[PDB]
Amino acid sequence: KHNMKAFLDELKAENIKKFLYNFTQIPHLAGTEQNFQLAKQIQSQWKEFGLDSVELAHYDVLLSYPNKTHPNYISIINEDGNEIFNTSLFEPPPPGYENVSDIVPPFSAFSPQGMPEGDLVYVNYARTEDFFKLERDMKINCSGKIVIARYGKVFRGNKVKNAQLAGAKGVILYSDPADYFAPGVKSYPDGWNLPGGGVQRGNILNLNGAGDPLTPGYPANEYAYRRGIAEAVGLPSIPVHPIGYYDAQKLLEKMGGSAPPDSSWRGSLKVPYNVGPGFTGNFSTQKVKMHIHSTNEVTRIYNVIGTLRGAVEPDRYVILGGHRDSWVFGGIDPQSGAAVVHEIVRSFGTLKKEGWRPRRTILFASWDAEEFGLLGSTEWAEENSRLLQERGVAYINADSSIEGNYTLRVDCTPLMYSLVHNLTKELKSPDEGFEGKSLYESWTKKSPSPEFSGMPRISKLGSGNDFEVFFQRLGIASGRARYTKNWETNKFSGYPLYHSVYETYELVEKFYDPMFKYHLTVAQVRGGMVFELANSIVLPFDCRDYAVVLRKYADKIYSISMKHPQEMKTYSVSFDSLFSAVKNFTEIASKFSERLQDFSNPIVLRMMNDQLMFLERAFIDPLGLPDRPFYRHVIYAPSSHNKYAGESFPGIYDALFDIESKVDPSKAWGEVKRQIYVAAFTVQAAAETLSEVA
Amino acid sequence: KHNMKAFLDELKAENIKKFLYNFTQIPHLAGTEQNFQLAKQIQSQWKEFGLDSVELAHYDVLLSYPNKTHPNYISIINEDGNEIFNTSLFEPPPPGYENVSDIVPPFSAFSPQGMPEGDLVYVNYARTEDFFKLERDMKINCSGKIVIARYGKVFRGNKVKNAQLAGAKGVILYSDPADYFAPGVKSYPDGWNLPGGGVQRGNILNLNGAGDPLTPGYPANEYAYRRGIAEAVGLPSIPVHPIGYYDAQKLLEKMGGSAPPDSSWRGSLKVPYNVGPGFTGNFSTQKVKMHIHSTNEVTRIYNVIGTLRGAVEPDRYVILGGHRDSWVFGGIDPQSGAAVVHEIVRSFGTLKKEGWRPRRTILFASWDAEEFGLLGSTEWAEENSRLLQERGVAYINADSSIEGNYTLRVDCTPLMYSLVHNLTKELKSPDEGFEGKSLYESWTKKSPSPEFSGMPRISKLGSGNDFEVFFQRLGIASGRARYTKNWETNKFSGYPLYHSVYETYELVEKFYDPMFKYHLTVAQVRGGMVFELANSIVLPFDCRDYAVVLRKYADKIYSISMKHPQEMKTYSVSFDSLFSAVKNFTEIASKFSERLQDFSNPIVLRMMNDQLMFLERAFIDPLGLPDRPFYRHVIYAPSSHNKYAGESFPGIYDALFDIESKVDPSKAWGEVKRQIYVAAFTVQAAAETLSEVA
Ligand SMILES: *[C@@H]1O[C@H](CO)[C@@H](O[C@@H]2O[C@H](CO)[C@@H](O[C@@H]3O[C@H](CO)[C@@H](O)[C@H](O[C@H]4O[C@H](CO)[C@@H](O)[C@H](O)[C@@H]4O)[C@@H]3O)[C@H](O)[C@H]2NC(C)=O)[C@H](O)[C@H]1NC(C)=O
Ligand SMILES: *[C@@H]1O[C@H](CO)[C@@H](O[C@@H]2O[C@H](CO)[C@@H](O[C@@H]3O[C@H](CO)[C@@H](O)[C@H](O[C@H]4O[C@H](CO)[C@@H](O)[C@H](O)[C@@H]4O)[C@@H]3O)[C@H](O)[C@H]2NC(C)=O)[C@H](O)[C@H]1NC(C)=O
Ligand SMILES: *[C@@H]1O[C@H](CO)[C@@H](O[C@@H]2O[C@H](CO)[C@@H](O[C@@H]3O[C@H](CO)[C@@H](O)[C@H](O)[C@@H]3O)[C@H](O)[C@H]2NC(C)=O)[C@H](O)[C@H]1NC(C)=O
Ligand SMILES: *[C@@H]1O[C@H](CO)[C@@H](O[C@@H]2O[C@H](CO)[C@@H](O[C@@H]3O[C@H](CO)[C@@H](O)[C@H](O)[C@@H]3O)[C@H](O)[C@H]2NC(C)=O)[C@H](O)[C@H]1NC(C)=O
Ligand SMILES: *[C@@H]1O[C@H](CO)[C@@H](O[C@@H]2O[C@H](CO)[C@@H](O)[C@H](O)[C@H]2NC(C)=O)[C@H](O)[C@H]1NC(C)=O
Ligand SMILES: *[C@@H]1O[C@H](CO)[C@@H](O[C@@H]2O[C@H](CO)[C@@H](O)[C@H](O)[C@H]2NC(C)=O)[C@H](O)[C@H]1NC(C)=O
Ligand SMILES: *[C@@H]1O[C@H](CO)[C@@H](O[C@@H]2O[C@H](CO)[C@@H](O)[C@H](O)[C@H]2NC(C)=O)[C@H](O)[C@H]1NC(C)=O
Ligand SMILES: *[C@@H]1O[C@H](CO)[C@@H](O[C@@H]2O[C@H](CO)[C@@H](O)[C@H](O)[C@H]2NC(C)=O)[C@H](O)[C@H]1NC(C)=O
Ligand SMILES: O=C(O)CC[C@H](NC(=O)N[C@@H](CSCc1ccc(F)cc1)C(=O)O)C(=O)O
Ligand SMILES: O=C(O)CC[C@H](NC(=O)N[C@@H](CSCc1ccc(F)cc1)C(=O)O)C(=O)O
Ligand SMILES: *[C@@H]1O[C@H](CO)[C@@H](O)[C@H](O)[C@H]1NC(C)=O
Ligand SMILES: *[C@@H]1O[C@H](CO)[C@@H](O)[C@H](O)[C@H]1NC(C)=O
Ligand SMILES: *[C@@H]1O[C@H](CO)[C@@H](O)[C@H](O)[C@H]1NC(C)=O
Ligand SMILES: *[C@@H]1O[C@H](CO)[C@@H](O)[C@H](O)[C@H]1NC(C)=O
Ligand SMILES: *[C@@H]1O[C@H](CO)[C@@H](O)[C@H](O)[C@H]1NC(C)=O
Ligand SMILES: *[C@@H]1O[C@H](CO)[C@@H](O)[C@H](O)[C@H]1NC(C)=O
Ligand SMILES: [Ca+2]
Ligand SMILES: [Ca+2]
Ligand SMILES: [Cl-]
Ligand SMILES: [Cl-]
Ligand SMILES: [Zn+2]
Ligand SMILES: [Zn+2]
Ligand SMILES: [Zn+2]
Ligand SMILES: [Zn+2]
């Protein structure tokens, strides 16, 4: 028999291990020859594995690279202009790789060039609330200062945007051991912690979904018209550079001015964590000087796109996608995900060679340039948006399969909650102590739902990965799953060796998943999801689960507004329309579910499958959110303060945020009311797609 | 048998006559009680005729009405401020209606209030090229002048926009006999010509597809957030008022300054047609003074929406829509169309009572407030956009059925050209001299295609009617057909009694169509189209006809650019990508057509029907055209100089228009190149929707 069990049993931990080793021997930086060679290898193997067609889709996009003959670094500079301390020019390479070439040194991709010199201000994690505390409570002015900020908590591009709007002239990002050194574990090569010479690479763009900075809205193909650099989307205006904690210690130890306002501002280094501006009396005349010489360059990137044509509904696409480009060796990020995808393709191809085809078409993608802003997935989606709009059932992402070894982590649309619960009840837990128990059971025990007893936690989708264009721009039901750690407050900060040269095959094989059983479990969850989506006769979406969360989000946004009762009285701010819409959605979704269970008629079925597929689509507003035209979903958007986190009712949330500080309250509350109207209208309109059609 | 012949034979001229009489006894101005009563009557009759459901959909939109106790008028005012001549306060009512109440006097809907006084400038038809001639060649300055312009050639809202941008302080529109008095025919009541006291009403908005000025993007429902008046879309900033040619003669006869630049500026009145500014020497101190006191008011409007549920594909909608609101009695506009729709509903309902149902769902609509800017159709489409986007097959409009008695006039998407040719070959011509000949034969003889021998003329869709939101915003295949005159250069000017009190049942019954045979022919064309769209197993669209016109439009826009060869050399302006895309579209459409003819499989059929239905949809760009976000179709938009006319490749056309006058040619040509990229990309993307799906 060719059923899900057949598919799942064909998946092998040993194959995932072999592929991970194969993908992590050399760096695969986007836009380099090594990454094009790997693209061609994947294309060849996917063909051999049995896919119907496998093509490369290429685009020419803006990328950013250090200057190989003019290195980036930071100095402390004395009175006469002597550089008395310099940060490192590279991370000490790990054992056995000290002769690997083409390791890109640490840098902040898309930083402009410059050599700003000035006094430091320490800004904690450079969050919106950190800058509020500095400016509003401590009365510290960042204008013309170099800001130094620890990585963690929020996406680094939000830190840089926040520093820019505070008037900083440069930003120094560093990894504090408080956030990147787990107590009781040794530094790499002897454990999974970050060494003091380790540094986290990463882009610092604020693209808000646009894709290639030069071609927002349209694919960066051969004849594309490109914006000039000055009109490009999302580029920072001040130099930025990341460093390790040995270097950070040197920059922070001399800091003077005000003490940290409280303990949540102190990391684990043996320094005071003074906010400054500048150094204590004796060194008051020393300054910090950045030297940044990276260049932005239009460069070709390559996505691999494989197709397994559906036997019954070939014009319905279920997509499994994840990226292939890495900062250096990509031992976790992305190759632990890419190896999982490779073994999924292999398993589907085995069934296919025995005569099976899925009901719907499955597209597999190896995206390029994810690390430079989701560029490959986004340009491809821009090129194919009409096909995806009218045919896309679902998108399952497949970046890193592991960031820990504790339990499952799933973020998805409410439409997939039931599918995930059901699938996980049928899979074996890989966890010690849960042998012979289901994955659902271990996951629910280790990660309890905050709302419901006997259910696991499933989070909203944010952004910072390749599902963004499919979900937030195009309104295609999306999900992601991986194995994760038990470190709640580190949820968005990365595992310690994130985007460092130390993220290697050996890291994974020695410290994370020596038996590749967590990888295998993730392959079963991602592959199982794709299988059910592509093969179930009725699409495995439950609209009633959206109704439940919509009520939760409506209660939440109302509660935020109700912190301002006088203003809601003055400006007649009512949430009645939104609750009415949610109530109607709940009622109509209940009735639709009855019909779906109560309906041999392929037209009624497909009519109903189209209602299910277009339901996520109905939450899209073609006008986008305010000043973010590529974030079009009215229920979910990446937080304006942290791209990694999702926000619900984002248009109303942003209208309410810090509203007590707005100069014209009439205008500000008017915009809250506008956003309430838009949300109520969109929820009612989405509900009406589930009504009987005629 | 229940086939198209059965449907067509049930249609009766005598019924169309009865309904036209019934709909034209009293005025039905949008937002008045009389128009709500007619809505309720139609709703009741459509129920009795057999439709499955018939509901009213209401909205509260910005409308505009004169002040009943403070009348609008224009004066010539002497030196001391004595008003020595006043324009009329109303049109002399026609015989037997001199005691009808609630006839709205002539006014320009949405005019602001004001009493500007100044010197006149005569601006011909107030077209872009008329203002070019005045300002650039004659060096006449309109700043602070009252402009007087004859109606005709272009939509009146474009005239007002052009006057506003010339710096006019008011606009006077009038009907010249050159454009509204056909030689050899008598004035109304004794013929179909405009009397000198007759005046054409009409709105002067520039909404560019937005719908209700206060709620762009969203339906004007009960909880809608409305823009304040100062941020409303499309409102004119200077007072405007229309008058008849008896009054115009009085204003024009004294005109001094420069002579008309040439004869195309002279109408048929016994005046010099001097451009001025101001009056000849003796009257040099007299001025013209407007008195406008109309008010804009949010007012409820009502659409009637009837549904005939499809037997096989109930989730596919074929829509027949036209408006019900009239300026006064609406004898031609809209009731000659509404009576046709009423008899179509009756015929479909007769078949239905005998057990028949169409394959797909047919929606019938009686729209409100068309005269105030397409408000009813647009608000409804805003409310239902997700259903229409994913389910709308086609929209057939049904405003006035006749504007003459000479031959057929059809404007539609290329996807419907074959359907129209085939249907008209099967219908009888109503024309004298063509008895026993097909409508195709008479139409082709009287209105030859300019490209093809043995084919009739079919024009592009522009705007100025209720199909605009469906076609240009949402990308639903649309068409319209009516009987028309033989008066080429009057194509966009209206029949003489257009929007006047003289447009009555008697006008039609005596002078246009005494036997109602032209009405019947139009009912057969509109109803026949709806029947085939709603009942053909394969949708009756031919994609190859789009390929042919795309090549024609590409040649045309290239030819415009090639008037500037030096600039195309300097800025490397290439149309190669656009011709490549058109070539690919032609190739793929040829292959798709072969498969469509060469393919018992309902999934393949419907897959292919979805490819056909979504092909018009593929020409939509979600980002819209520059500064016109609601005009989203890349191939067709209403001309920026004349809303009634369609423009092809509008984004490139507007980038090229008057480019030799732009201050920064580098920037201007860069935008031409951008628009070429967008067009080539969109044509290629639409082509790819016709490729095999997987
Ligand atoms: C949730 O679904 C329900 C349907 O089950 C839907 O109910 C609709 O509510 C609207 C808005 O309240 C109703 O609108 C009314 O319609 C009547 C005519 O049917 C009008 O006369 C009413 O207008 C009068 O009253 C208003 C309020 O006092 C005045 O402001 C106005 O000036 C008029 O005097 C009003 O327009 C509509 O009838 C129902 N439809 C039903 C019950 O079928 C509700 O809107 C949905 N929620 C959302 C957010 O869409
Ligand atoms: C119409 O359909 C045809 C397909 O039948 C489609 O043809 C495609 O054209 C593009 C653009 O010309 C081709 O792109 C090339 O792809 C190759 C790899 O396949 C690249 O090496 C090429 O890049 C090199 O050459 C460029 C031009 O000199 C350089 O600028 C560049 O730096 C590189 O050196 C180039 O990207 C593509 O291969 C074909 N695809 C085919 C034949 O299948 C055409 O684009 C369609 N028209 C439109 C408007 O879409
Ligand atoms: C996750 O698994 C659950 C448990 O199997 C699925 O819910 C179950 O779905 C079946 C099929 O619809 C339901 O059976 C139906 O019951 C009604 C009787 O009320 C009958 O009319 C139908 O003919 C059919 O037998 C069953 O009730 C339901 N169980 C529940 C809700 O507790 C669920 O669909 C799965 N989710 C997926 C596949 O996305
Ligand atoms: C308008 O009417 C014309 C003339 O009838 C229609 O074109 C004709 O359509 C039929 C049905 O597809 C074609 O017949 C097919 O011919 C091929 C043989 O090459 C065969 O493989 C198929 O099985 C089928 O018999 C016919 O060739 C074609 N005639 C033409 C193009 O001259 C046209 O479809 C109508 N347009 C509509 C309905 O929108
Ligand atoms: C990763 O595995 C691939 C595929 O097995 C290896 O590429 C093959 O290498 C052999 C020996 O050079 C060649 O004969 C084949 O042509 C290659 N196949 C391809 C590219 O499809 C590759 O060597 C492995 N890489 C590493 C680092 O082990
Ligand atoms: C930090 O690096 C800088 C740059 O290489 C060093 O300063 C240079 O030293 C060389 C050789 O002594 C001089 O010729 C250059 O003029 C200096 N360049 C600049 C820009 O100052 C500096 O010595 C290093 N500091 C430490 C402590 O190692
Ligand atoms: C237009 O026709 C309608 C329908 O025949 C007429 O309305 C009907 O009038 C009679 C007599 O008053 C009533 O008994 C019915 O209730 C009406 N039916 C409706 C409204 O559905 C209407 O009188 C006609 N109007 C004119 C001007 O002739
Ligand atoms: C044009 O109409 C105006 C407005 O009604 C007339 O002027 C008014 O005449 C009355 C009565 O004689 C005066 O009391 C008002 O003061 C005048 N109003 C204004 C605003 O001027 C005028 O007489 C009419 N002109 C002609 C030629 O009929
Ligand atoms: O440019 C972008 O939007 C993201 C590019 C690149 N994305 C990325 O590294 N994503 C990593 C983020 S690590 C933090 C995180 C965030 C959300 C989550 F569910 C799990 C982990 C990932 O999703 O696995 C980056 O964050 O630098
Ligand atoms: O507000 C608008 O966009 C149009 C409202 C109203 N529309 C209208 O009268 N349309 C009439 C326009 S008469 C000129 C014309 C234009 C195009 C055409 F095919 C036939 C006639 C119609 O289409 O029958 C108007 O023009 O004032
Ligand atoms: C890299 O280093 C120096 C800095 O000016 C120079 O030789 C070369 O132009 C640089 N390369 C760039 C800017 O890509
Ligand atoms: C911050 O500092 C700069 C110093 O030049 C000044 O221009 C700016 O106004 C200051 N802002 C505040 C809030 O003190
Ligand atoms: C794997 O699990 C064990 C047991 O809880 C833990 O001690 C170890 O640190 C984990 N490895 C990683 C990388 O989290
Ligand atoms: C109509 O006429 C006069 C003008 O001021 C006044 O009595 C009334 O306010 C007006 N009605 C309006 C402005 O709707
Ligand atoms: C037109 O006339 C007004 C008169 O005040 C003036 O402001 C404007 O600059 C003039 N424009 C031209 C082109 O003469
Ligand atoms: C109807 O047709 C006749 C014959 O051509 C023509 O003389 C008459 O003017 C037409 N009526 C109208 C309103 O066009
Ligand atoms: Ca792009
Ligand atoms: Ca609106
Ligand atoms: Cl992921
Ligand atoms: Cl029409
Ligand atoms: Zn990644
Ligand atoms: Zn990453
Ligand atoms: Zn009309
Ligand atoms: Zn009209």
From Swiss-Prot, chains A, B:
Protein name stated in the entry: Glutamate carboxypeptidase 2
Effect ascribed to mutating residue 421 to Y: Correlates with lower folate and higher homocysteine levels
Cofactor binding notes: Binds 2 Zn(2+) ions per subunit. Required for NAALADase activity.
Effect of residue 399 to Q: Reduces enzyme activity
Resulting phenotype, residue 334 to A: No effect on enzyme activity
GO biological process, one term: folic acid-containing compound metabolic process
Region annotation (NAALADase) ranges: 220-533
Organism, scientific name: Homo sapiens
Example of a GO MF term: metal ion binding
Membrane topology listed for this record: Single-pass type II membrane protein
